[PDB]
Design a protein that fits this description.
Chain lengths: 50, 245
């Protein structure tokens, strides 16, 4: 039996590997949606941080 | 009521009082490319009235000894009006066409022209006469532009095939005693949804006299044949700088 708090609230022994991603069905290539012109400040898709 | 007609598209109108109905090639009207047939992702430009209108490009003189001529599409228009500009600035193009060939004479003249549309009209050469030389037709002969080109051997359509069977293609006849024009509507024909207006000619227009022109001394001897055509449902995509070839 356990009693000291640090042992009770311990995560030692967790065998389930948490996954940040998951597979999705993808039988065909993705479709293309209609898009229009965007003239915004704040929104900036083209800029990245490799 | 079938002999009379008016074709209006864009800022242009054609009238005729001796028509022979209208042929809609392969039984279907021109239409824009659907979202499932398309493959290129950019939004196309569809100029509408500035490019889908009648253009009168050339006049040939019909003579007792004429052999016949052909024009290639869209080649005939690549350098004309707003249509041409769009064909040059864009990689991709597609459209249908309304072709109106004109030729009037008098109730004392006679003759019959076969006017037909032949898709993928590939030209061949006479192979040096003996057939041992593997010659090829020059650019000016495969894409003659607006002046068109005269057939060397109409019987085999300069391609080893019988003109006697050309009627298996959308066509009309201009039989002087009956009508003075031919009208053929052609939908876009290709194995791809869009293509280059410069590198590929979707079809050729053939105007060939099968029954020779004839009249008596004294009747007007100059009998012109004029070619007028209109793009229909023109679409362009893949924009960049203008290119002529």
């Amino acid at each position: 039996g356990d009693r000291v708090a640090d042992v009770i609230e311990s995560s030692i022994g967790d065998s389930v590997s948490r996954a940040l991603t998951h597979a999705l069905p993808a039988p065909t290539g993705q479709n293309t949606q209609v898009s229009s012109h965007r003239l915004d400040t704040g929104k900036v898709p083209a800029l990245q941080a490799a | 009521s079938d002999r009379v007609a008016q074709l209006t598209i864009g800022n242009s109108t054609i009238t005729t009082q001796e028509a022979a109905n209208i042929i809609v090639g392969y039984g279907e009207w021109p239409s824009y490319c659907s979202d499932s047939d398309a493959t290129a992702v950019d939004k196309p430009t569809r100029p509408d009235v500035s490019v889908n209108r009648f253009y009168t490009l050339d006049t040939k003189l019909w003579e007792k000894s004429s052999k016949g001529w052909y024009w290639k599409f869209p080649d005939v228009l690549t350098e004309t009006g707003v249509f041409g500009q769009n064909a040059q600035f864009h990689y991709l193009y597609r459209s249908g066409f309304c072709i109106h060939v004109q030729c009037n004479a008098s109730k004392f003249h006679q003759g019959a022209l076969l006017v037909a549309v032949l898709p993928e009209y590939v030209i061949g050469t006479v192979a040096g006469g003996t057939g041992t030389e593997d010659t090829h037709p020059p650019y000016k002969q495969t894409q003659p532009g607006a002046d068109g080109f005269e057939l060397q051997h109409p019987y085999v359509l300069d391609a080893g095939i019988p003109i006697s069977q050309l009627t298996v293609c959308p066509h009309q006849w201009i039989n002087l005693r009956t009508n003075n024009c031919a009208t053929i509507i052609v939908p876009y024909i290709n194995a791809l949804p869009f293509d280059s207006a410069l590198n590929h000619c979707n079809f050729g227009l053939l105007v060939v006299p099968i029954s020779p022109l004839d009249y008596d001394q004294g009747a007007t001897p100059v009998i012109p044949i004029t070619i007028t055509l209109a793009p229909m449902c023109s679409e362009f995509a893949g924009l960049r700088q203008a290119v002529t070839q």
